[PDB]
From Swiss-Prot, chain A:
N6-acetyllysine sites (modified residues): K58
Protein name according to UniProt: Tubulin beta-4B chain
Source species taxonomy: Eukaryota, Metazoa, Chordata, Craniata, Vertebrata
Tissue and organ expression note: Widely expressed. Expressed in the retina and the cochlea.
Protein's organism: Mus musculus
A biological process from GO: microtubule-based process
Curated annotation (Swiss-Prot), chains B, C:
Disease: Defects in Spag6 are a cause of hydrocephalus and of male infertility.
ARM repeats, residue ranges: 31-70
Assembly, per entry: Interacts with SPAG16 and SPAG17.
Expression tissues: Highly expressed in testis. Not detected in prostate, ovary, spleen, thymus, small intestine, colon and peripheral blood leukocytes.
Subcellular location: Cytoplasm, Cytoskeleton; Cell projection, Cilium, Flagellum; Cytoplasm, Cytoskeleton, Cilium axoneme
Part of the intact protein present: 1 to 85 of 507
Name the UniProt record assigns to this protein: Sperm-associated antigen 6
Organism field: Mus musculus
Effects seen without this gene: In null embryos the central apparatus is unstable leading to a loss, and presumably degradation of proteins to which SPAG6 normally binds, including SPAG16 and SPAG17.
Functional summary from the UniProt entry: Important for structural integrity of the central apparatus in the sperm tail and for flagellar motility.
UniProtKB/Swiss-Prot annotation, chain D:
GO biological process: one example: male germ-line stem cell population maintenance
Active site: E254
Gene, per the UniProt record: Tuba3a
Lineage: Eukaryota, Metazoa, Chordata, Craniata, Vertebrata
Record's function text: Tubulin is the major constituent of microtubules, a cylinder consisting of laterally associated linear protofilaments composed of alpha- and beta-tubulin heterodimers. Microtubules grow by the addition of GTP-tubulin dimers to the microtubule end, where a stabilizing cap forms. Below the cap, tubulin dimers are in GDP-bound state, owing to GTPase activity of alpha-tubulin.
Name of the protein: Tubulin alpha-3 chain
Keywords assigned by UniProt, alphabetized: Acetylation, Cell projection, Cilium, Cytoplasm, Cytoskeleton, Flagellum, GTP-binding, Hydrolase, Magnesium, Metal-binding, Methylation, Microtubule, Nitration, Nucleotide-binding, Phosphoprotein
InterPro entries given in the database record: Alpha_tubulin (IPR002452), Tub_FtsZ_C (IPR008280), Tubulin (IPR000217), Tubulin/FtsZ-like_C (IPR037103), Tubulin/FtsZ_2-layer-sand-dom (IPR018316), Tubulin/FtsZ_GTPase_sf (IPR036525), Tubulin_C (IPR023123), Tubulin_CS (IPR017975)
SMART domains: Tubulin, Tubulin_C
Modified residues (N6-acetyllysine): K40
Organism: Mus musculus (Mouse)
Cofactor(s) needed for function: Mg(2+)
Amino acid sequence: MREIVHLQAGQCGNQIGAKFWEVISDEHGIDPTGTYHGDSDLQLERINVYYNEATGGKYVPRAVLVDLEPGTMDSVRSGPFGQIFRPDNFVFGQSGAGNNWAKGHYTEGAELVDSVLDVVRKEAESCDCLQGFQLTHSLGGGTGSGMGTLLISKIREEYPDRIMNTFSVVPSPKVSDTVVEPYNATLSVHQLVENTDETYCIDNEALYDICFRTLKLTTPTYGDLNHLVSATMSGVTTCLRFPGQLNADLRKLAVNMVPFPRLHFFMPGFAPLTSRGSQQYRALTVPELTQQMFDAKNMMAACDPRHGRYLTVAAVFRGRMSMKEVDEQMLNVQNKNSSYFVEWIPNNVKTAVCDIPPRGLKMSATFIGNSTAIQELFKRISEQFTAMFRRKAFLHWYTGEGMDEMEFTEAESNMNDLVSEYQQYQDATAEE
Amino acid sequence: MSQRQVLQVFEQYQKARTQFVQMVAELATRPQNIETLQNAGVMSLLRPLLLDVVPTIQQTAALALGRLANYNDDLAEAVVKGDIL
Amino acid sequence: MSQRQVLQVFEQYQKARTQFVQMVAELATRPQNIETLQNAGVMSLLRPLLLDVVPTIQQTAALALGRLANYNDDLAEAVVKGDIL
Amino acid sequence: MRECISIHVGQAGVQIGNACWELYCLEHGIQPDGQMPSDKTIGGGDDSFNTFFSETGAGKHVPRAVFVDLEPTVVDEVRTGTYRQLFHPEQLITGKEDAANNYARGHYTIGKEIVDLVLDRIRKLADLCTGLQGFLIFHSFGGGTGSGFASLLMERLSVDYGKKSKLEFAIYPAPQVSTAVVEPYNSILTTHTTLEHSDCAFMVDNEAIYDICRRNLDIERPTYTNLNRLIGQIVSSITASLRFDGALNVDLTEFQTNLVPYPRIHFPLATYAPVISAEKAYHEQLSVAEITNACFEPANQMVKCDPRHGKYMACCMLYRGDVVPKDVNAAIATIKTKRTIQFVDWCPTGFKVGINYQPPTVVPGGDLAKVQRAVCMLSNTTAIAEAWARLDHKFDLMYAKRAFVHWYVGEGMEEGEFSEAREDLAALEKDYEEVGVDS
């Protein structure tokens, strides 16, 4: 029946996908061996969305790991749950990307792409009917950013009637990992705005700040960030994984959340981010959740939503509370904070409550919104790209691959068009 | 792959000149390096620049030859003496 | 900037020379290669091989083509399709 | 997979390779015999040793390196050592006549005689390997063997393999102290070859090593052993994510792609830390921010140059040992706002994150202590262009009246190359200052 095919790209993408798989297996009651060890009710009926029915009830994961370096498969396989996946899906090459989008797309994206197309088409035909494809990757490298966009384009071309959601990682001038990162970001944004349904923004610096100032962790590492993003996606996908009273799905939000195809980015966020000594002193209620989903402090963005106006808001809840409190809260928020949302569109907040609470936590609620706060990231990326492209630094590497420089020109032209559009829609006046 | 590389190398020299040309869309504005390269009768080396395969190259190779010809009387007469007219 | 431009232009001219010669000589040996060069659409891209000014390129190329078009009506007719005649 | 071949030319290259191999064997628990005789008490060795060593059917480890030298005395000195049972005699090619700080003979009348042998050796070694990424060429500019022979071999390796990375590691003739006199004569010729025919080149000297050892390790009578130990530790830190794994693996290509901004500017500034002795590592709290700040200190640089004279364009950041990401983020936030450190007005940020879970090890008999984490820095700045300026000045003031040039004329070479090398160096310097000039 209705299933979702999951895709993997990039070492960071691989690790976050593995963390998500471990989280969902633990929540749904799956032993590391491969059998079932759950004790719930809804964990058997719709469990096939991410798994596959097999003999002996041994459900198998549904995710294809795409990488250019063999060193990631061994790392992700040696873990407590790396022996449950499909080794056939671990399609790795012999040469690394070298943090090059052009070289990876050209050289390591021709002779290796056929195998992943074959395996994904086999998986697609293995099921009856599908909805969309989930790909988790990062733009920091030639593996995730160089390959995911290509696989995204191919799957759109073959099956246009599918949902295209991703959780790519946005860069940050403060926290960098690649010298040519602005070039890769500029190249990837073109494909993201041309050949992708929807995209979610992921930043590591904001998560680091959030954990440091709220979670108050001793030695925060990438494991904590992977846990956070896995919980984020779990709260995102519980609308279909665990039906409640008011259920939703990915295309319904994708239609109701996106006013125009060119602006498909979002701003995810989870509500209960507390310290270890604060877990036993907290008041589980609605207004607290509303305040933590509305404030910019809890938000995982490396920017400020208060600089613009809110466009669309979706509040997805997961618990057993009520319905009246949500509508009254959003009503009084829109009445009070009138200068923070678009006045031309009333009722920009969407209600969604999942009657099934998560495993390990009783109340949970995520925030999916598209606020006017990415414009600063866009403009700073455009500025740094223009500065890099003025004297044409770090360009001979891409030139030697074969592709020309006009691609950067058209990419920055589209960049300027997109940002102009964004800022002339930020001030969405009522009339003249 | 050998036949694909046949097509590929042909198109690769094709697009190499294409890119030289889409650059000389703005390179031709600069005469000092044009003369620096040109001194050794390199108008003969610009003779095969009309032997330039597809529209994607010729299209701005003409824009090159233009600003090449603006620099003096002699470069405009070079299309005559180089038998490029 | 135009000096380095013309340099790069001419090392790519020379690599085009070497590659064109080596590949025309190589791919004209077997009948399946004849039929594939017929069907691969090479000849619109091999049109420069009877077009450009380079001596060695064209000599090795067209000699192999005489080998190539010898096998069948197919390759020689596709040479017409490549608008080389 | 991630496998590379090391090249050792000259006495310095041979001894550096020996130090690197012994460091690798001690750090991986590899016994000098070549077997695993530890059958009573194990002490490690269950790792990915395929990067450098090879596994046979009987459990033997064969080194993958090239030990070539025009003089047989160094080969004999190594052969009588305690590790003669590890490598193979075919890998150490001797020679009748040597260069001994001469480019002419070692490039025309000496190095051209043994070409087929080493070419067959390296071809066999490459065929024995599956995945090849780059090479580790160890030579010297002062040594004639490491200058003429190295140049002629790399010129063929470049034309035989274009898709493979070509690294470079040698020693710089210090402006203050020096070993020989004709060092600039070989250097001015080797620089052109390493610039117009290679991708990356690492340049280090000895006076900085002496200064840092006398300042931190506090030794009054230094020796070449510690000099080789420092270089071996640097090399191991550079190629750390290849033999092992970590949070963010950084391969040779991953850093080499960004470390080269332009085809002409490929001379990074290496800086290892902490370079301390045993007592200098006991009562000293070591964190990441302090060592990162110390890495930019000119006193800790292996090249005698003031970074404040110029500014930085591209930076490559590495780590090895138990390092926490929060410390790295704090250090990056600290250094990005430091007014002392100068950088170009276009590049706001650039660096890498290599997290290596394996901490660096120690050697019995060495001077390095047990440090929980290490750090190495590969930055690119124009302030190092002064060394080329001084070298050009010295070559010009030695070339006016043609001192010690009749020997090279008699050996057989064209004198215009001195002018060619001089003008090429002038153009390269001009490009360096043009890049260093902002808007």
